[PDB]
Design a protein around this nucleic acid. Sequence first.
DNA 1: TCCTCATGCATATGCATGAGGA
DNA 2: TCCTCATGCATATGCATGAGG
Lengths: 78, 81, 58, 58
Amino acid sequence: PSDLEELEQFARTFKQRRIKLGFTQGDVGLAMGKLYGNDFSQTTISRFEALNLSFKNMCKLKPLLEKWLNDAETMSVD
Amino acid sequence: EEPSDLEELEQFARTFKQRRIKLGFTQGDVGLAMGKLYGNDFSQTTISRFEALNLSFKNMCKLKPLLEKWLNDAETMSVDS
Amino acid sequence: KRTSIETNVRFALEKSFLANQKPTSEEILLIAEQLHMEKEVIRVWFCNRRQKEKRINP
Amino acid sequence: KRTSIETNVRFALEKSFLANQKPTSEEILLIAEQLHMEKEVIRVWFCNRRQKEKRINP
DNA sequence: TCCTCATGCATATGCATGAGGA
DNA sequence: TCCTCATGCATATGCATGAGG
Ligand SMILES: [Br-]
């Protein structure tokens, strides 16, 4: 609940969830650009999953990656 | 498997790297050009391993002539431009 | 389901390679059982470790 | 366009960071004089090592 | 899937850029 | 005229695949 623990957990769960969907780090960066306008690089995704980014930049990316996960995990659900 | 063959591989690997960088090609650019030049594309990983000799002697010897033709063609296009 | 090797597991697998570079399918199963890993991950690791040893520069 | 550090130069360059994490423009130039790198190669290295220290993980 | 052999996807990261504030 | 900050190109490599013995 500390908010830093919220980012840690979300970053860990994002990795496992990205891998379950069969998406590369680079595919996420591109899908976000087409879906939300600004694309990101495989390097930026990799750093997010490993918490190699500032707490300010980790907070800026979370909601973007959060929206993308909702769309990708419901590809099969009619 | 003579040692002069191993020194020929060392020397050329150094010469290929410096010349690739002088010509302004990425390792990935080489991998793509050869697909168009020889039909068989190669990956950034294989180019990297070649420049550092992270490959078997047998593997090195088969790639050297391929990479050599590409470099020779590139070294004459850059002196014409 | 990606498989990554723990740092200390990698040292253990290296220690066994320096002792025996080519284990049998049975030994692979016992190493995998002792390390609680899929047998193919150990099977492939020993293949790659042999290959890299036959490089001009490992 | 990238310039790469041998390895032992990086250890000495790391030792300088641990001594002074924020050197002045003069110190960076003398650090480069002691090592061999360009003066701007060293300015940026200290920038990134400061950045890396300001991360959640490293 | 048991080996060798040639090869690469996917990833981690060293070095860099540039916009923006002292 | 150096810093901070967000960001990435380029490269190295861990684990893998598949063709063939
Ligand atoms: Br063991």
